[PDB]
């Protein structure tokens, strides 16, 4: 017998181990592999996909499809705000439940840039210019078109190109940010304002709707695996 | 390895190896060869045991808890928020450096004790436990049997009493390029609220529980957690902790004397 | 595909890593780097022992 | 024609002269410099004010006395009110910079005393009252120096300023591990340190975190015979070096 | 400096371009172009007002 | 630890020539002393410090 | 004086006699009320064996 | 980085520093060294203690005053009680050695005075009383300095200590032919001489013969204004160099 | 990186050290040095058996 000294951790069961083990079914001939379309290799290929964000998850609308409809209309004043939510993709009632959000909730650390796409869904006769802006954490949250504009932004004119892509760049003191809401790892603020009120001709709808999609850029990544807080259970199903 | 001694003879010069200006902040590179005659001594002594790696690389208890095999209402499992400041020993060691970076070797020592009753006919089977780690944000357990113990993603360890203590390895899970041992800052940008290391602190909880009740007789198990840094990196040395510790979430202390006193500034009979 | 390193004496020892995550490896104690010049002599000006710190 | 006392430092519109010095202590041997593309996370292009910010700002003076226990100044903040430095500091989420600290104090050949000038990075301090946390005003007062005490501090939310422990629960006489120089009236006149950016992250906010504290504690009490000038001031002058800023937006602090 | 050789002191000589008011604090003055002159054996300090104008010449 | 087998000797300081001062200058002064190891210094055998105690887990 | 910063202040003055002693402590860096609590002392107290030369600087 | 004042001398476990000096006078240009086989008579092998004996011994101090006429110390003996030197000195019939004499005295910039430090080889002295010979105790008191007088000495068996003649019947102001240095408080601090073995024989007994006497006479009287420190001591430190010994036996002196 | 040594007979055995501290190794029993001249004949003068210890 070759002299052996067992070390701590023996006969232990570690959920995330990774050793070889005896096959209960020897020489089994597995069914040949086919070539199904759309194969996934990494959960990121998912999060790089756009999904609609329920930005207007307001007053009961989360129960309706209206949760995704951003309200916009002709106003008798400039600078009015359109909407705003914090760059907290992981634990934010708005984001957390998207494709990007869902994936994030299976981890604990995240890093990367984000793409917010906006699609104007008003009559082709309607016009207007908007100011989409991201203000890093530090000062308060912008409450004026000014202030908001001193941040990173893009001014989107609604011409034939009805979809504008704002792009929240990664800017943090640390490499990764917690997936949960931790003020140490605050993410900043995302706001949108009227650059030039919605102008419409006669017999054309004044109020329209804007849709918003979230997705990660090619520099996005995640770490630390964990169960989602989103799915519970009381007894075994049947 | 250490430096060996150089042979020294008598001198007569304007060279002042004996005098400098400490006000410089530079420490003197004065050896005994200066200020006195010396023989030659080939010194073999090695500093091998004082390497940062070796100073830290030794398992140390950082905490421990309890839980019963029985109790109605669930409520018979324990948890502990990972952190290394509830124990005096190791904290002081880690706090001899401002920033550090290292992997961790987790070792658990689980034991069970049986308490007095009236219960009879007890022939208790082996006890099997479950330690489950829950990264921050993950769904936490409520009762000794809430669904979350499935650990479909959260890693955990199952262990049967009587065997070698459980053990795992953890990579450098820090967010920044290193662990911070101190933080002269706040959590919010308006200096309101939490001040101290307590803000960087956020590494999830650890959940323990009996898998099987064993017998109807009352039992109480205790789990001891042991850390052991590996592959270490340390930056910016600090004065060891002088005052005793008072809180786990901050530097708070009550003023302490620099050392102990003696009778005269001349007493060799030290305290 | 193993590796042989010398032991701590006043002879070597073979070794292989069995795990995929480098964090699983044992502490590297055969290490011996050292720079005291950080903590002592952190002056922008090099000082000659024979000379005075003021001239 | 020189003396290792003589010394002329220039940054921007400012210039420092040293008629009596030792040398110049340099951080941990590391000289400050701009963050490399290899150590960065923030993807936006940084601002490098340069001359407009990396210059010599001279804080309010303080009077040294026969009883003075000591003083300290937190740093990321202290310059929060100095020209365009403080500004770039208010408009940005992130920032990083090195410094050239120059403490100046002068007496006559007949005065005597000795000060310790150190730069404690990450100088977290304890509260006078075990159960609480010391309020911000007690921690730092910008350009206004804070004071240590020759005894135990008291209640509420103040800092445990008793000097023997530097309010950090350590032995005051060991602060010498951090960058430092001594001002020994008998042979000195000024002390100069060059602190490089030191932190566990490439950049940080500047109002939420004080990456280091300057402390000036007298170990050899000031003294002089009757007739000698009685007012001996101490003056701190600091200059930001290689300041970068990221994440521009409106200004303030939450 | 023409005081006894036993006297000491550090001074702040400073030039503040026109634009804002005139400095009325050591601060303010110090935000301008300056030199801090310590009175050691070198009793003569040379501050140097550099040319800084919107125009090339200035009226006399 | 303090073991007479391993005694270390004695460190003393004396006036070689009294402190001389002119008129109007302080007679009494203070001397500071710093300790540190040379390039031939080393240590062995790891052990916990006798300097830090504890009674219950901190909070 | 261990409670005050004076613990580090060595007293010296003008005397009417020669040879008076200034101070004295044993070379027991590890367990000596004077040394043991220094940077060198602190480190030493984490070990059990030591060897090497020491530098005492006076200012 | 130097001053022809600076100076560091080391022999054995002893070390000397000079923050204020002139140069170092060296005997008659001759530097001390071990006796050659060509100049020797004693055929037995000599002992060369080295470090154990050739080191710095510091005699008892003496107080300088406004009236102090002077002091002197015979030498072969004076070290008769210093460690292993004095010992090898008691167990041997013959011995020879050189020396490094270092007289130290310090005042302030406000004190003034001037001492003459000389090494008179073969300093035979006269008796206070013409008819007799001065007794041993009057000639030398080992490490205890002997004193000159500002007048005529008196009767019995004392030495004619009147300073003007150095007790040798010469003009005190001419002692400058022998090895010497001046300690001029105004510019000095210490004096250092290197006396080589000087005698008409390769070796000699050490208790029967004093091959030279150190004298410290003040030509410029010490003075200072009221308030100045009043106690100004003088301290002699000497170190044997290249000491050889011959003719070993029991110890003592007849 | 192992090593083969001969066994104790009237064939070898392979061996590898798995630990970093040489103190962890097994006792070296394959050793066989010997000098009785220390204890016997410790005389400065070599003695011929055939001769007498006095002549
Ligand atoms: C079944 C397997 C279970 C495995 C469970 C692993 C649990 C994690 C244990 C990590 C221990 C890290 C100890 C490092 C010390 C830092 O706590 C300190 C010390 O003062 N401060 C700080 O808190 C530093 C701030 C850095 C923030 C890092 C965020 C992750």
Tracing tokens 């024609």 back to the chain, one arrives at D1
Three-state SS string over E22-45 comes to: CCCEHHHHCCCEEEEEECCCCCCC
Q: Are B5 and B38 in contact (CB under 8 A)?
A: yes
Q: Are strands G47-51 and D190-195 parallel, antiparallel or unpaired?
A: unpaired
Q: Are H51 and H12 in contact (CB under 8 A)?
A: yes
How many C-beta atoms surround the C-beta of residue D254 within 10 A? 18
Q: What residue spans of B98-247 are helical by DSSP H?
A: none
What secondary structure does DSSP assign to D194-211, as a single string?
Answer: EEPP--SSS-B-SSSB--
- DSSP class of residue B61 equals E
What is the spatial distance between Cα D231 and Cα D64, in angstroms, rounded to a whole number? 7
Per-residue tokens: A116: 């917010």
Q: Is the CB of B202 under 6 A from ligand 1?
A: yes
What domains does chain A contain, in order, with CATH numbers? 1-238 (2.60.120.20)
What is the spatial distance between Cα D87 and Cα D97, in angstroms, rounded to a whole number? 14
CA D104-D110-D115 angle, to 5 degrees, is 35
H3 touching chain C per CB within 8 A:
yes
Q: Do chains B and D touch (3 or more CB pairs under 8 A)?
A: yes
- DSSP class of residue H41 equals -
Q: Which residues contact B61 (CB under 8 A, 6 or more apart)?
A: B87, B89, B224, B225, B226
Decide if B164 and A8 are in contact by the 8 Å CB cutoff.
Answer: yes
Q: Do chains D and C touch (3 or more CB pairs under 8 A)?
A: yes
How many CA atoms are closer than 13 Å to the CA of H92, on its beta-carbon side? 26
The SS3 of residue G7 is helix
Handedness of CA B48, B52, B57, B61 (dihedral sign): positive
What is the spatial distance between Cα F8 and Cα G26, in angstroms, rounded to a whole number? 7
Per-residue tokens: A137: 């954490």
**Which of B97, B156, B185, B203 has the most ligand 1 atoms within 8 A of CB, as the residue to mutate?**
B203
Query: Which residues share a beta bridge with D120?
Result: D213
What secondary structure does DSSP assign to H52-109, as a single string?
Answer: GTSS-EEPPPEEE-SS---EEEESTTTSTTSHHHHHHHHHEEEEEEEEEEEEEE---T
Atom of ligand 1 nearest to the CA of A14: 1
What is the spatial distance between Cα B95 and Cα B107, in angstroms, rounded to a whole number? 22
How many C-beta atoms surround the C-beta of residue H71 within 10 A? 21
Decide if G18 and H229 are in contact by the 8 Å CB cutoff.
Answer: no
Chain G residues with CB-CB distance to F42 below 8 A? 50-52
Nearest CA-CA partner of A94 in A104, A86, A105, A106: A86
Tracing tokens 């476990």 back to the chain, one arrives at H13
Decide if B266 and G10 are in contact by the 8 Å CB cutoff.
Answer: no
Q: Which CATH architecture has domain D1-254?
A: Sandwich (2.60)
Q: Are D134 and D127 in contact (CB under 8 A)?
A: yes
Atom of ligand 1 nearest to the CA of B95: 20
Q: Is the CB of B157 under 6 A from ligand 1?
A: yes
Give how far the C-alpha of residue D151 lies from the chain's centroid of Cα atoms, to the nearest Å. Answer: 23
The SS3 of residue D105 is strand
* C-alpha separations of D249 from A82, B114, D240, H1 in Å: 19, 63, 22, 54
**Which of B57, B84, B155, B196 has the most ligand 1 atoms within 8 A of CB, as the residue to mutate?**
B84
What is the spatial distance between Cα D252 and Cα B197, in angstroms, rounded to a whole number? 24
How many C-beta atoms surround the C-beta of residue C38 within 10 A? 13
F38 touching chain B per CB within 8 A:
yes
What is the spatial distance between Cα D4 and Cα C51, in angstroms, rounded to a whole number? 12
Containing H26, the helix (H) or strand (E) segment is strand H25-26
Q: Are strands D112-120 and D180-184 parallel, antiparallel or unpaired?
A: antiparallel
Q: Are D101 and D236 in contact (CB under 8 A)?
A: yes
Q: What torsion, rounded to 10 degrees, do the Cα atoms A97, A100, A102, A104 define? A: -120
Atom of ligand 1 nearest to the CA of B155: 1
Decide if H12 and B35 are in contact by the 8 Å CB cutoff.
Answer: no
Chain F residues with CB-CB distance to D220 below 8 A? 29-30, 32
Shortest distance, CA D85 to any CA of chain E (angstroms): 11
Q: Are strands H25-26 and H190-195 parallel, antiparallel or unpaired?
A: parallel
**Please, what CATH class does the domain formed by I1-55 belong to?**
few secondary structures
- DSSP class of residue H46 equals P
Q: Which CATH architecture has domain B1-271?
A: Sandwich (2.60)
* Structural domain boundaries in chain H: 1-254
* C-alpha separations of I10 from H169, H248, I34 in Å: 101, 66, 21
* Structural domain boundaries in chain I: 1-55
What is the spatial distance between Cα B24 and Cα C45, in angstroms, rounded to a whole number? 10
CA H92-H94-H95 angle, to 5 degrees, is 100
- DSSP class of residue A194 equals E
End-to-end CA distance of chain F: 33
What is the spatial distance between Cα D85 and Cα F19, in angstroms, rounded to a whole number? 50
**Ligand 1 center to residue B170 CA distance, Å?**
9
Per-residue tokens: A131: 């100011």
**Ligand 1 center to residue B83 CA distance, Å?**
6
CA H133-H134-H139 angle, to 5 degrees, is 145
């Amino acid at each position: 017998g070759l002299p052996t000294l067992a070390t701590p951790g023996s006969n232990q069961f570690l959920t995330s181990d990774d050793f070889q083990s005896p096959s209960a079914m020897p020489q089994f001939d597995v069914t040949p592999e086919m070539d199904i379309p759309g194969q996934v290799n990494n959960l990121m290929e998912i999060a790089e996909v756009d999904s609609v964000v329920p930005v207007n998850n307001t007053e009961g609308k989360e129960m309706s499809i209206e949760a995704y409809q951003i309200p916009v209309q002709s106003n008798p004043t400039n600078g009015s705000q359109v909407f705003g939510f914090p760059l907290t993709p992981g634990a934010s009632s708005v984001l957390n439940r998207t494709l990007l959000g869902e994936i994030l909730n299976y981890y604990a650390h995240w890093s990367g840039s984000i793409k917010l796409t906006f699609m104007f869904c008003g009559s082709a006769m309607a016009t207007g210019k908007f100011l989409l802006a991201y203000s890093p954490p530090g000062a308060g949250a912008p409450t004026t078109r000014k202030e908001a504009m001193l941040g990173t932004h893009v001014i989107w004119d609604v011409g034939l190109q009805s979809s504008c892509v704002l792009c929240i760049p990664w800017i943090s003191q640390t490499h990764y940010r917690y997936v949960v809401m931790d003020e140490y790892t605050a993410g900043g603020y995302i706001t949108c304002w009227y650059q030039t009120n919605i102008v419409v001709p006669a017999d054309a709808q004044s109020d329209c709707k804007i849709l918003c999609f979230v997705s990660a850029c090619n520099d996005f990544s995640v770490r630390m695996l964990k169960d989602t807080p989103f799915i519970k259970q009381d007894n075994f199903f049947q | 390895r250490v430096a060996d001694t150089v042979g020294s003879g008598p001198v007569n010069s304007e060279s002042i190896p004996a005098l400098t200006a400490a006000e410089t902040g530079h420490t003197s590179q004065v050896v005994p060869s200066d200020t006195m005659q010396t023989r030659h001594v080939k010194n073999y002594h090695s500093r091998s045991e004082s390497t940062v790696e070796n100073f830290l690389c030794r398992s140390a208890c950082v905490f421990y808890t309890t839980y019963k095999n029985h109790d109605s209402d669930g409520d018979n499992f324990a948890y502990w928020v990972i952190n290394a400041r509830q124990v005096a020993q190791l904290r002081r060691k880690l706090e001899m450096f401002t920033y550090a970076r290292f992997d961790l070797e987790l070792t658990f020592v689980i034991t069970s004790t049986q308490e007095q009753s009236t219960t009879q006919g007890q022939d208790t089977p082996v006890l099997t436990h479950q330690i489950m780690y829950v990264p921050p944000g993950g769904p936490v357990p409520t009762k000794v049997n809430s669904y979350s113990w499935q650990t479909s993603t959260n890693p955990s360890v199952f262990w049967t009493e009587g065997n070698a203590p459980p053990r795992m390895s953890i990579p450098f899970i820090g967010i920044g390029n290193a662990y911070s041992m101190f933080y002269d800052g706040w959590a919010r940008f308006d200096k309101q609220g939490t001040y101290g290391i307590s803000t960087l602190n956020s590494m999830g909880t650890l959940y323990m529980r009996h898998v099987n009740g064993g017998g109807p007789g009352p039992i109480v198990s205790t789990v001891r957690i042991y850390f052991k840094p590996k592959h270490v990196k340390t930056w910016v040395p600090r004065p060891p902790r002088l005052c005793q510790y008072k809180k786990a979430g901050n530097v708070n202390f009550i003023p302490t004397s620099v050392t102990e006193g003696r009778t005269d500034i001349t007493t060799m009979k030290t305290t | 595909g193993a590796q042989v390193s010398t032991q701590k004496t006043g002879i070597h020892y073979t070794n292989i890593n069995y795990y995929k995550d480098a964090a699983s490896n044992s502490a590297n104690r055969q290490d011996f780097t050292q720079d005291p010049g950080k903590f002592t002599e952190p002056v922008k000006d090099i000082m000659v022992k024979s000379m005075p710190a003021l001239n | 024609g020189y003396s290792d006392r003589v010394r002329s430092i220039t940054l921007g519109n400012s210039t420092i002269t040293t008629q009596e010095c030792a040398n110049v202590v340099v951080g941990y041997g590391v000289w400050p410099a701009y963050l490399k593309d290899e150590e960065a996370t923030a993807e936006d292009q940084p601002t490098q004010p340069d001359v407009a910010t990396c210059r010599f700002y001279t804080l309010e003076s303080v009077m040294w006395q026969q009883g003075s226990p000591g003083w300290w100044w937190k740093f990321p903040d202290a310059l929060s009110n100095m020209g365009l430095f403080g500004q770039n500091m208010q408009y940005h989420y992130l920032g990083r910079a090195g410094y050239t600290i120059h403490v100046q104090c002068n007496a006559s050949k007949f005065h005597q005393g000795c000060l310790l000038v150190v730069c404690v990075p990450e100088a977290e301090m304890g509260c006078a009252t075990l159960a609480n946390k010391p309020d911000p005003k007690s921690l730092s007062k910008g350009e206004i120096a804070s004071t240590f005490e020759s005894q135990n501090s008291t209640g509420e939310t103040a800092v445990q300023a008793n000097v023997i422990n530097a309010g950090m629960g350590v032995g005051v006489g060991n602060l010498t591990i951090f960058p430092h120089q001594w001002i020994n009236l008998r042979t000195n006149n000024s002390a100069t340190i060059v602190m490089p950016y030191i932190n566990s992250v490439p950049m940080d906010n500047m109002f939420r975190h004080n990456n280091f504290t300057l402390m000036v504690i007298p170990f050899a009490p000031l003294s002089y015979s009757a007739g000698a000038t009685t007012y001996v001031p101490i003056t701190v002058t600091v200059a930001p070096m290689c300041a970068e800023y990221n994440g521009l937006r409106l200004a303030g602090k939450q």
